């Protein structure tokens, strides 16, 4: 109502969360993707992905410190999506779009799937 | 470089973090302010406040599930600042500006202190 807003707040919060991840501060889960490990914060994963939201709201899976993804998942595809979760920037290229799209479908990140479909249709 | 950006990403992440707080999902700390308790996520507090960043990077304080603030701190002032951390909106009013400013000085949130000083100087 009588609220004022700090424009850069949400992006500053995101940048600071990424610095915590980068420095391994308060990370509480290891995501394993075909023998490669990625440290992260469960709250950030839940806040970006429908799959991680369903995993960490489960009464048993919420307690796990290690989550293994389907080994057919591309770790570069996962890494591109994890970087997007922590920064808002999606490094989408001709050489990775198919892997990024398949990973976003798996992670239930519809906005990413949508942009991938648009970039593919523009190329065809 | 070849990155695309989802404009609403950071604000969607923040809104989802606030929904997790509201539903008490993965909250990992209780902030006590003159016998009133506020549940939160340590990572969000660290990402917004210099004081919480110093507390939760300390090798002993990082393990505490309860943090007591100075009892002279105003809980409404704290609540306004916690709501700002989780939403980007600061409910700054004539009746609370002095308490909000003192709380922001204590929490080391310089951008909030700055806007308070500007609103006070405009009134004088």
């Amino acid at each position: 109502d009588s609220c004022i807003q700090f424009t850069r707040h949400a992006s500053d919060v995101l940048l600071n969360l990424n610095r915590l991840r980068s420095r391994d501060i308060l990370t509480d889960v290891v995501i394993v993707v075909s023998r490669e490990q990625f440290r992260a914060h469960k709250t950030v994963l839940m806040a970006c992905s429908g799959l991680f939201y369903s995993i960490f709201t489960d009464q048993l899976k919420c307690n796990l410190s290690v989550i293994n993804l389907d080994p057919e998942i591309n770790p570069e595809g996962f890494c591109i999506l994890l970087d997007f979760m922590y920064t808002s920037r999606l490094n989408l290229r001709e050489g990775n779009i198919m892997a990024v799209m398949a990973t976003a479908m798996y992670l239930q990140m519809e906005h990413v799937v949508d942009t991938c479909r648009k970039f593919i249709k523009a190329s065809e | 470089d070849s990155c695309i950006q989802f404009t609403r990403h950071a604000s969607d992440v923040l809104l989802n973090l606030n929904r997790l707080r509201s539903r008490d999902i993965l909250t990992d700390v209780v902030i006590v302010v003159s016998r009133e308790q506020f549940r939160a996520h340590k990572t969000v507090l660290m990402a917004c406040s210099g004081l919480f960043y110093s507390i939760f990077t300390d090798q002993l304080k990082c393990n505490l599930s309860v943090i007591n603030l100075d009892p002279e701190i105003n809980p409404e002032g704290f609540c306004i600042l916690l709501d700002f951390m989780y939403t980007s909106r600061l409910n700054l009013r004539e009746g609370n500006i002095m308490a909000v400013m003192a709380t922001a000085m204590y929490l080391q949130m310089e951008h909030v202190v700055d806007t308070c000083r500007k609103f006070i100087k405009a009134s004088e």
């Binding site: 806040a47 239930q108 519809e110 | 989802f6 969607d12 809104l15």
Partner: peptide, 5 residues
Amino acid sequence: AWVIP
């Protein structure tokens, strides 16, 4: 986009 319930 993803919005939590």
